[PDB]
Structure formats: C-alpha cells, structure tokens
RNA sequence: AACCCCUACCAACUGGUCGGGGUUUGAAACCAAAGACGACUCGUCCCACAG
C-alpha cells in the first residue's frame, strides 16, 4: 500500500504503530493499533485503518489519487501470528545483541530493519572494495597481492614503515615482522616507480601548473594502507579479530592516525578548492544566460549554484531532500539552462510562501504544492501512468514562458567532514563512473532509511540505542548528506595528462599489434622523438594528441585498463560470436536515427538498403579486424585542415565503438562476478552469525570443509556420516510413525482412503513424512520447507568441498575476468553474459581440477567439455553454500532469476 | 520476478485458484537516486587548439 501512503511499522512493544510518509517535517506516526483500537496519533485522516475481516487484516482506504482501481482490498496484521515476526534466517536476536545490545526485549521489528540496512551497506562496500583491490593489483602488475590480507595496514605510519630498524619498539621487536615490513617497503618502492600510476591520478597525482607531479610518499602510503585496511575489514568474518576489528570502518576516528586523517583532509580540501575556483571562474558559461532568463541580480540566482549543480541538495525552509525531488525527465522537450529555470520555478514555493507567512494560517499555498505533486506521483500502483503525471505537470508549468531560447564558502572543509565520507571518496578514486554512482546511491538510500528509522523509533516507544562500537550510525543523516555532496562531484577527471611510454605501449596493445617489445618502445618514442633523438616541436605532436584524445583520455579505456590487459582484451574482441552478440544487443534497444544506423553511417559510410543484420555483420567485421597498422600507415592524418578530416573522424568513431564493445563485455563480466562475491561475503557473515548464535560450525575449517558448512548446519540433522546414517534413519522412521499415528485428528482424516500398504499412497506419504521430519529439524525459515530441504539434502550428498573452495577463491580474485581471453574462443554459442561468465569459470575450475576430481563432478566436467556450454547441475552444485538462503540460491543458480533487468526476456 | 506471510474454497499440506502485504528475503518498500544503456543539440572529449 505504498501508493496510498502506507509505510507502517509492524512490531513495537505490544502495539502496532502504523507510520506514514516521513521526510516532510510532519506525519511521523499516523495510526496506532492496540488490540482492536483504531486510534490515530496525528490528525487529518491520511488513510483508513479499520481492521479488515476482524482477524488478520487492516482495511486501508483513501480519498483521491490512491484508489484501488478495481476489485482489491488491502489488509495486513503482524500480531495475528502471535509472537514477533522472526527473521527468516533466525538471527534477529543475535543481530540486536550485536548492534543494539540491550534492545526493547526483542519486541520490535524496526531495529532488525536498521540492521539489514547496515548489512546491505556492508555488502555493497565489500563488493566495491574487492573490485578496487583487484584493479590496484592488476595495474600494479606484480604477482604478489599488495592489497589483500597479510600486507601493511593503517597500524604503522610512513616513518615506521620506511625505517623499521629505528622503530623496533613499534613492531614488538619481531625480526620476522621487520623483514616482512622491509619486503613490503621494497614492493612499495617498486610501486611508486611504476609508470602506470597515472591511471590512479586522482589519488597518487596532484594537479599544479601544467603537468601532474607525484605527491609525497606519505599520501601514497596512507591511501594504500587505507585500501588494505578496507580489504582487511571486508574479510573480517573468518577471523574474529587479530589486528583490525569488525568496527574499524566505524571507529576510524579512534583507529586511524593523524597522518591518514591529514591525507584525507588534504584530498578533500584540494577537491573543494578546485570546485570553488571552478564555481568562481566558469560561472559565466551559464549565469550570462540566467541573468536574462529568470534573473534579476548576478548575486541572487548564483546562490542556487554550488548547492544545486555542485551539491544536488535543497536544504530549504521546508523538509524535502534529494530523494524527494522530481526528475522531470528534462521536461521532455539548452539542457543546462532549461533544467535550472524549471528548478527555480517550484523552489520559490519553499522560500516565498514558506513558514515566514504560511505558519500563521493552516496553509497559504495549496498545501505545499511540491509535496502535493510528490504525493500524486507517490501512486506507485500502475506505474505506467506516472509518466502521464509528468505530461500533466508540463502543461501546468507552462505559465513560466521563460524558456524562449535559453562566492562565499559553501562546501565544508576536510575538518568538519567525517572520516567515513573521506575514506569513501578515496575509495571512489579507484572506481569508474557507473560504479561510483551505484555505490554512492546505495549508501545514500541505506543511510537515509537508517536515519528515518532512528527518528521514528523514539515516537513508537522504542528506546533502543547503538553500542559504543556501533555508535557511528547515530550521524546517519550527516553521513547521507556528505555522501550526496561527494557524489555530486566524484566524477571530475579520471586520467592525467602526463601519459608515458608505458601508456602508449598499452594503447598500441589494445588496438592490436604483434610487434616485439623493443619495436613497441621505438614506435612509442617516435611519438615524441624526431629522427635525430630530439623532442618534437610544437604542432608536430598530431599522432600523439590523436592517441591521447582517442584511447588514453577515454573513461571506457581506463575501466578496461584497470580490470584487464590490453592484449587479452584485443584477443577477446577478435571473436565474432561475442561481438555480434554485443552489437546485436545494442540493436535491441532501438525499440525504446537508430544507434546501429548511426554507427554504420559514421564508421562505414552512407550506404542505403542494408538491413540491420548486415549492418551488424559489417560492424563486427570492421571491429574484429582492428589493428594498429591501419593507423600507422595512415599517420598522415595529423593534417586537419579539412582533407583528411573525414578519415580522422571515421577512425575516431571506429576506436570509440571498439572501446565501447570491450567496455560492455568487461563491465558485464565484472557485474556478474560481483554477485557471487557478495554471495560468498553473505555466506561468511552468516557463518559468523550462526557461530555467535550458539550452533556447531567451525569458522576455521569452513574453507577446507567447503563453504557449505552453513548449509549443512541449517539443513538440520547431519547424515554425512556412515555410522550415524542408520541411527538418523531409525530416529526419523520412528518420528514419521508417531506423526502418522497422531495425524488422525483433523481434516487429514481423508488419509484413510489413500492406503493400500503395498506400494500406494500409504508408503508414498510414509516416505514423504520421513522427508518432512528430516525437514522440521532445520534452523531457519528457508530450509524448514520440505521441498527446499529435500533439494538441499540431495545436493549435499554429491558436494565437492575442494571445488567449492576453489570457486569461492577464484570469484574474489576475478580470475574469470583475467582468463576470459583464453576461453572465449572455445564456446559453441554465446547466449548471454551469464552463460559466458559461468562457462569461463567452469573451464578455469576444470583446468585446475580435471584430473583431480571424481564422481559425478567428473561427469559434469565431461559434459561441459563435450557440449561447450555451462552446466546447470554443476552450477547448482556450486551454489550449495548459498543453500541456507533459498532466494539467493535460486537467483545465483537459475539464469531466468539472476538478472532483474533481463526478466522480460524469460 | 523468484521467495515468504494472509482472510474464502479445495488440497500431505513439497499441489492450486480471485486478491493483498513484505526496507524485518534475494542487486531488490513510494517518490527520487543509479544500473541494464549504447545516443541525440549547446557549459564534460567542441580539437582555435595541446607536452
Ligand atoms: Mg533490504
């Protein structure tokens, strides 16, 4: 009933406190239910709350914009089942004891929602931190993992790390530890001398004058130690605590050092000073037109900037926030001016008719017309009609008629910004634009939900408070505001302008080349050195500028270089099967000139009559035939007076399409691998939770025994022992006989007709009763269902713990994204990125565990070898560690339920 | 869309039917914010320019 305005809570003490739409400085608690009560805390009759059917439902109704639109009746009642609504994992008590400690004696269900939001934060952070760690390990080029567990962390400063001999007291006088620190310092010294640091120029380089100069080693060591500490914190589930605890990200203010704090403050101050200089200088690009279109004085309309474009916030006299705005779909009609003029229209209803004159009467304006439009748009029922409200709103804002043609310190410094937000910004310094947007949006939404729940808790009678270890979440509103601010400018410049010979060789490699390394070095030197060894004069750098503007300065190429190898990606792009699938997938978006037609016109020519399939085939032929020798022989493209301009633009478009295809492939692979990364993170988290719960599970041997330990624990009684098999069978047979004898007391009395005792429904239901008795011993609401319990017990008897451990270890290291180049050309047919990723993973596991495996797993390996496609049974056997959660097990093992965006195809 | 919980009718109940609910299940409640998703034209990669 979200469309009618129902965001009600369920359990709070012994009453049902039905909440409503928050974030409006009003309507925090609408209805309160105790027994058969219908009393309302607030006034106004937002929605009806009469008890439907008087047994297990509350009939909700509304007056306008929230009609059921047909035969429908809304009903819900939490207290009908008796006790509080237990979580399906059966760990809400442990979660409340961990995060809240002495909660409201378990008689609440908003604390568990806050804890689930925290867990979602942890999942998304672990995913993106693993991605950033893999990117740093790939760009570093070293075989040794410099970010994973075992390397340096935020415990030692740069002075102690550089000179471990004079700081022997800090390392507990351990000679092995001192030797390890010396080895790590040697690796760090080799890391600074790596010319590939320009890829992470936002974190390891500083902009000053005209070139980029590497900052001091202090900041670089601080950033690397912060990344390593994040990597240690996201893996703090197998080990309880050795040096970095689980609350490290929350106690950073007490765990980090002044050096790391100063590094984060320096980064934040640098980016904020750049933003301030930009807002002071480049304002004339828009204020010159705004002064004529909805503008009186240059100091008046400029106040909206630095808060609208650089902050994406409102912070007006009302209570609406970034999540309570209207996208407006760019008015569905240049773009920069029209977006600001329309934003300036409905913003006056929050300052001109605000509480300065509206607080005296009930409402001066039409009850906050912005919030009223939000409520009218809140009718999520039949969302295919929400776009009609934008059309009606566009016909209402026509009174503007202004779209004819179309200084002080605003942002905080590094001191009044949380270390959490500064570390999130430093982490986004290692991610792409899409990844940054997704991560920051998820974090903003989760923190906003957390702060809303924390504001609702005291009014519904919940006095739960966070422990000292998790008291960081008390500032969730400030955290969300800082994250919104950071997201507003976290995508301003990925690469640097100081590209080197290494980057030139990488650009030549990704464009296709078979020359030796010495020949590549010579060709890269020819970009800046003449035929006599001197640097080229000004104006003779045409080829180098072209390569820069086409390859190195491309965000897609940056994403490709962070997660992949240029030669490997070039070998990937030579396969016509996958390229035709990617190009064919772009042609399917035309249902929403065409993109394929534009690509064919800009890359191949203005030929007509060619069908879509022929255009895709031609684009595949010109993309698979990509080679740098095409641009080398035509190096005369440096002339840009107008003759070779057509060929230059054609080459630009071809390179753009090539990089776009490879970027799509790699991004899909990474997004699919991140799902199983999050899955194994959840497996480890729930393992630790069930260990803290009081059950029998070995967190030390969950690696050797396979990650299916949680699945075996939640399945119930373990029957994986030959001596215990007969005992368990006899006990379950006795239980089934007792249940059959005791069933004859109710509507299942009809069992007296389905009995023949030879092989009929009698013995059939006897076996099914044995199965459900085995199922009732489960420890969670998922595996308590007899169907899923039987499926899990069948999957457990044929499990391969070594194969599961290998799959878990390879899912975190992105070995699929590493070895895709070696197994992409061994596929019979590519149907989707899901099947591609899983075939590559199974091929890697086979290459590692073919001669060592046996039993049914060898049959699945042989089937994969013969059929040249992924095996669904082998996949669902690898998802057994996910067996404790049935939705996750079904989403990560079934292709039709994996992707939510591709659900329309299935 | 998978899963879970519901009043009415059947149904070992590991089946279903009209409908509702789930931020307390899965990337995963409303509005927004991302993503699938590549573009179009006007402050982001236009070269009047930049090693
Ligand atoms: Mg959730």
Coordinates of N, CA, C and O (backbone and C1' of nucleotides) and ligand atoms in Angstrom, one line a residue, chain A residues 120 446, chain B residues 23-24 26 29, ligand 1:
Chain A
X120 N 23.3 -4.4 4.2 CA 23.3 -4.1 2.8 C 24.5 -3.1 2.5 O 25.2 -3.2 1.5
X446 N 20.5 3.7 1.9 CA 20.5 3.0 3.1 C 20.7 3.9 4.3 O 20.0 3.7 5.3
Chain B
rU23 P 8.3 -3.1 3.5 O5' 9.8 -2.7 3.2 C5' 10.6 -3.4 2.3 C4' 12.1 -3.4 2.7 C3' 12.4 -3.9 4.1 O3' 13.7 -4.5 4.1 C1' 13.0 -1.6 4.0
rU24 P 13.9 -6.1 3.9 O5' 13.5 -6.6 5.4 C5' 14.6 -6.7 6.4 C4' 14.0 -7.3 7.7 C3' 13.2 -8.6 7.5 O3' 13.9 -9.7 7.3 C1' 12.1 -7.1 9.0
rG26 P 18.4 -9.9 1.6 O5' 18.5 -10.6 0.1 C5' 19.1 -11.8 -0.1 C4' 18.8 -12.4 -1.5 C3' 19.3 -11.6 -2.7 O3' 20.6 -11.8 -3.0 C1' 17.0 -12.3 -3.0
rA29 P 14.0 -2.8 -1.4 O5' 12.4 -3.0 -1.4 C5' 11.6 -2.2 -2.3 C4' 10.2 -2.0 -1.7 C3' 9.4 -0.9 -2.3 O3' 8.8 -1.2 -3.6 C1' 9.3 -0.7 0.0
Ligands
LIG1 MG1 16.6 -4.9 2.1

